[PDB]
């Protein structure tokens, strides 16, 4: 698929989640982001579709206090405004 | 399915992972245990089938430093020696 180049901040989160590249496909970006959320345990204990990022860089990146993985559209928009190139 | 009654220690781990009962089926015990491991992040970052419990009560409970989720037989044996009743 097409390669995307994340901004420095998004790149640092993916890297801390184990990514080794600087260019990925959207599926790798999504995969690595779930690992970051998992490792940091930002999701809600009871309602596990809610991710709380108020005091985490993910909140600075997306600019929200939280989000639902059950709202795919808003999520993709937050990721997209954070790709310096959606076609590398 | 049959109900099992975990020992006090195993009970405290399940409870901390969100369990509300004192009697469960083996599937609930397994479900709650994965949540405990998940919440505490005891699994290995790279080889995610390896659970490190050397400095966690799970290690005291099982009596091991680690284990592989890829060895189902040893796991069930560790759980079984920790049920005061495998039929409640």
């Amino acid at each position: 698929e097409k390669l995307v180049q994340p901004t420095p901040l998004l790149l640092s989160l993916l890297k801390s989640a184990g990514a080794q590249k600087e260019t990925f496909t959207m599926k790798e970006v999504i995969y690595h982001l779930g690992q970051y959320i998992m490792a940091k345990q930002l999701y809600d204990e009871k309602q596990q579709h809610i991710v709380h990022c108020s005091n985490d860089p993910l909140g600075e990146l997306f600019g929200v206090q939280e989000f639902s993985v059950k709202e795919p559209r808003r999520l993709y928009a937050m990721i997209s405004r954070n790709l310096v190139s959606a076609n590398v | 399915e049959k109900l099992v009654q975990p020992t006090p220690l195993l009970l405290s781990l399940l409870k901390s992972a969100g369990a509300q009962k004192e009697t469960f089926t083996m599937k609930e015990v397994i479900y709650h245990l994965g949540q405990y491991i998940m919440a505490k992040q005891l699994y290995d970052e790279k080889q995610q089938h390896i659970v490190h419990c050397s400095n966690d009560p799970l290690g005291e409970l099982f009596g091991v430093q680690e284990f592989s989720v890829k060895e189902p037989r040893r796991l069930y044996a560790m759980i079984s020696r920790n049920l005061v009743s495998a039929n409640v």
């Binding site: 999504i30 779930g34 998992m38 579709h49 993985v69 | 998940m38």
Partner: peptide, 11 residues
């Protein structure tokens, strides 16, 4: 349904 489950269903 756990986080992993939902994340894995991303449309």
């Amino acid at each position: 349904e756990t986080f992993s489950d939902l994340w894995k269903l991303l449309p």
